[PDB]
């Protein structure tokens, strides 16, 4: 548990807000694991300093630098920058097992039981459910795996322009092999699904442990009324409201005195 | 194989067209199994006669009749009519194992290997992928199972108003148990997904064995140009076009001389 971690990634300040809320939500639900965040030089110094408070480890990744293992793949396929940066999660060999969570996820309950899982365990992606959604996955840091992923990234790219395509291509037995590597959908609950199959959300949505904010508007792009504790208009804003409650209650106060 | 069957359901003439195309597509791809269709008295006599040509067995279900086992459940929950009728698929104990396919599915390749599967095997539903989509499932006829399903239908209804909710509730270990009961998504490929995750469709859609026509427009509600062999406008109408090719080529000619 001391050598296990939740790992996220922020490549900018907007997603840094995501990561800060995510990390705060993990602390709120009393994870016994470490919290690590991949950051890039495009993340501002104050966001980085905030990340240093919320996270146990802030790891700077600069894929634009020739010294980075992924740099040559980035030059070949520059559009794969976010993915290549994310793949550095496999470089974190100080950890024996990690749960990667995208900075646009939100933890609603302790999910430390994810560390019982093996690489690669991920929840099904809605839309194409024989692919896993790469917003939340259990993996084992390994330079070997990292190199292998980089190699596939270089050779093939990713069928969807992101880490999800590449991770599915690499971890391609997921759909047909080992039900235990199917994380329950509630560990990576697509915010889109919270209305795409509304009866199912009503039936099973109360069990949500992780909400994954997808769609063209991320939580930080909403307006939140701190008096009514509600985002301003999707009659299930409960999750957005949790995100904003954490952001306004825990995250902003953390940054709010940086001017000092 | 002689006691195994594909089973579909038509509760009206529009879906009877679906069933006829479905059954024709199964014959086209050379199933060695029987073809059975549940029909209702709301299906016209000529549609029924067409079904008698395409299918090996046409089974009439009249849930509006007090003599039907499901009738009392129908009176209790009248909106569950389609589902209750569908559940009669479990009454077909002349078969040892069946693949149920909704009348809005379309077979693109032989799928007889589905009969290797056990009850309940179904593909994940996009949208809520810890539920299976009940458009295509492998099941074993059993009066006992039928009665148990009716009982749950009576007691609880269905969380989504259809067979899918009830079947998921009953076969609730699907998401967490036995990867072999996850049919590959290509055995029940949502027509909606054919654009909801477009990169995935491009990556894996060529493997489609069954297309499931979802959305507010069923294939028979489209206009098909027989000269250009294309439905008239979703830049993947290929599947609609297959459906219409079968309908215009095999199904309509079958009915076209009924006036005689
Ligand atoms: Cl398994």
Curated annotation (Swiss-Prot), chains A, B:
Lineage: Eukaryota, Metazoa, Chordata, Craniata, Vertebrata
Keywords: Acetylation, Cytoplasm, Glycogen biosynthesis, Glycoprotein, Manganese, Metal-binding, Nucleus, Phosphoprotein, Transferase
Pathway annotation: Glycan biosynthesis; glycogen biosynthesis
Free-text description of this protein's post-translational modifications in UniProt: Self-glycosylated by the transfer of glucose residues from UDP-glucose to itself, forming an alpha-1,4-glycan of around 10 residues attached to Tyr-195.
The reaction(s) this protein catalyses: L-tyrosyl-[glycogenin] + UDP-alpha-D-glucose = alpha-D-glucosyl-L-tyrosyl-[glycogenin] + UDP + H(+); [1,4-alpha-D-glucosyl](n)-L-tyrosyl-[glycogenin] + UDP-alpha-D-glucose = [1,4-alpha-D-glucosyl](n+1)-L-tyrosyl-[glycogenin] + UDP + H(+)
Residues that, per the record, bind Mn(2+): 102, 104, 212
Cell compartments where the protein resides: Cytoplasm; Nucleus
First and last residues shown, out of full length: 1 to 266 of 333
Gene (name only): GYG1
E.C. number: 2.4.1.186
Highest taxon of the lineage: Eukaryota
Protein name (record): Glycogenin-1
């Amino acid at each position: 548990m001391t050598d296990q971690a939740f790992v996220t990634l922020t490549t900018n300040d907007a997603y840094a807000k995501g990561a800060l809320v995510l990390g705060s939500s993990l602390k709120q639900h009393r994870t016994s694991r470490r919290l690590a965040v991949l950051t890039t030089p495009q993340v501002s110094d104050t966001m980085r300093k905030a990340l240093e408070i919320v996270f146990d480890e802030v790891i700077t990744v600069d894929i634009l630098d020739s010294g980075d293992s992924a740099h040559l793949t980035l030059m070949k396929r520059p559009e794969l920058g976010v993915m290549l940066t994310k793949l550095h999660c496999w470089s974190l060999t100080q950890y024996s097992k990690c749960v990667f969570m995208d900075a646009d996820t939100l933890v609603l309950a302790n999910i430390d039981d994810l560390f019982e899982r093996e690489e690669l365990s991920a929840a099904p992606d809605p839309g194409w459910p024989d692919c896993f959604n790469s917003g939340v996955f259990v993996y084992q840091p390994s330079v070997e795996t990292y190199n292998q992923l980089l190699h596939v990234a270089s050779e093939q790219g990713s069928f969807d322009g992101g880490d999800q395509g590449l991770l599915n291509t690499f971890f391609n037995s997921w759909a047909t092999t080992d039900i235990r590597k199917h994380l329950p959908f509630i560990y990576n609950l697509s915010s889109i699904s919270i209305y795409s199959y509304l009866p199912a959300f009503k039936a099973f949505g109360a069990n949500a442990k992780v909400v994954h904010f997808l769609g063209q508007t991320k939580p930080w792009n909403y307006t939140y009324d701190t008096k009514t504790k509600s985002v301003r208009s999707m009659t299930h804003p409960q999750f957005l409201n949790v995100w904003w409650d954490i952001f306004t209650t825990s995250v902003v106060p953390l940054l709010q005195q940086f001017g000092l």
